[PDB]
């Protein structure tokens, strides 16, 4: 129930993303597994976002940064302006055609480990802007870990996607050292939130009438 990705920019592959993904089993060792759990906990409980913004979704993201929401409680407030110091790219805005090379460059300039959260309908699929100058989804050329529907998603939805990213990180397998062991990245094939919440979503019967407040 895992997927393995190995990347190779210099290999024979012209289209982005320059990676290969297969479906494998969990490789996980009486102490290596515990140390992998400890580093996964340390990575998931300390995620530093990239100060990269495209459009209105970034405004709601920095609304989440402020005091009335306090995403700092999750340890995700540091907001580095450099790609090298950042661990998470939140594509929060429209993936414009003129900025897709810029987004690809900034994704290349981040360092391992890296995670991608697409925020909003523009970043997910292009959204309302099925237009000549908009890339229909940032996942056309970068691998996206978490998707957030919304236009804009409210800040608590951004923290919900951050918690989903933390749950994804906390059970993935990565190379502990770059000199010993396999260098491929193992990510879990988790159950989707739609089928998980279908039990509690279908059973909804009555809501408050729109004339109230």
């Amino acid at each position: 129930d895992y997927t393995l990705t190995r990347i190779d920019p210099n290999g024979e592959n012209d289209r982005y993303p320059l990676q290969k993904q297969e479906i494998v089993t969990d490789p996980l060792n009486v102490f290596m597994g515990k140390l992998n759990d400890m580093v996964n906990w340390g990575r998931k409980n300390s995620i530093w976002p990239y100060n990269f913004g495209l459009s209105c979704c970034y405004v709601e993201m920095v609304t989440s940064f402020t005091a009335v929401h306090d995403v700092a409680r999750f340890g995700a407030e540091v907001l580095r302006a450099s790609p090298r110091q950042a661990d998470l790219m939140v594509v929060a805005g429209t993936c414009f055609t003129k900025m897709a090379p810029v987004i690809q460059r900034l994704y290349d300039q981040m360092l391992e480990p890296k995670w991608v959260i697409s925020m909003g309908a523009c970043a997910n699929s292009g959204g309302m802007y099925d237009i000549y100058s908009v890339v229909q989804g940032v996942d056309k050329f970068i691998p996206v870990d978490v998707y957030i529907p919304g236009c804009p998603p409210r800040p608590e939805a951004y923290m919900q996607a951050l918690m989903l990213l933390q749950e994804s990180i906390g059970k993935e397998r990565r190379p502990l050292s770059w000199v010993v062991g396999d260098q491929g990245v193992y990510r879990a094939n988790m159950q989707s939130e739609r089928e998980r919440k279908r039990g509690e979503r279908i059973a909804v019967t009555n809501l408050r009438t729109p004339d109230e407040i």
């Binding site: 005091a67 998707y147 957030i148 409210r154 923290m159 279908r198 909804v204």
Partner: protein, 180 residues
């Protein structure tokens, strides 16, 4: 610079430091997500559902008004008919990776079947799983509009509702009747 300007600036820095200290002695304004639930207004435009009539049947008549009123084009459906003659959606899919949660489909629904519920936690790992189907949209209740049924107004005969049994409808008078 002038000495008075320097003194005024020193007092200004001291005053700013004092006010941020009194901010430290103030009350916290954070809403503690996710430990306390987020208050959402009753007409908040979040996750889209398909609702039912008070009789318990699905309120959608597959009239395709929401799909064409959608400025994004992220609603797809097909009309099917039961044996009695009532219309229903054979399928109903919404691409939530593409939807902008604008509420034009709810505004354009003439049966109040499609509604935007106060729900925002729809984060997903794969955007193929963001294509919600009819089994993920149809809920077991009326939603925000509790006592509206479109078929009580329609003049089309279905099960449990013969001709003339709708609201503001007279009984069908046959042309073979003896009355002038």
């Amino acid at each position: 610079m002038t000495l008075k300007e320097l003194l005024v600036g020193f007092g200004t820095q001291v005053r700013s430091i004092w006010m941020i200290g009194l901010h430290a002695f103030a009350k916290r304004e954070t809403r503690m997500y996710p430990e306390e639930p987020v208050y959402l207004p009753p007409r908040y435009r979040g996750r889209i559902v398909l609702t039912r009539d008070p009789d318990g049947e699905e309120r959608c008549v597959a009239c395709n008004l929401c799909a064409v009123a959608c400025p994004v084009g992220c609603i797809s459906l097909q009309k099917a008919e039961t044996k009695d003659g009532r219309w229903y959606p054979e399928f109903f899919r919404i691409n939530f990776s593409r939807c902008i949660f604008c509420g034009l489909c709810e505004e354009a629904c003439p049966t109040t079947a499609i509604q935007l519920t106060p729900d925002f936690e729809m984060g997903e790992y794969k955007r193929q799983d963001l294509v919600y189907e009819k089994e993920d949209l149809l809920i077991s209740g009326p939603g925000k509009y509790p006592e509206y049924n479109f078929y009580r107004m329609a003049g089309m005969a279905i099960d449990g509702k013969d001709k003339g049994e709708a609201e503001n409808e007279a009984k069908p008078i046959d042309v073979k009747s003896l009355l002038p």
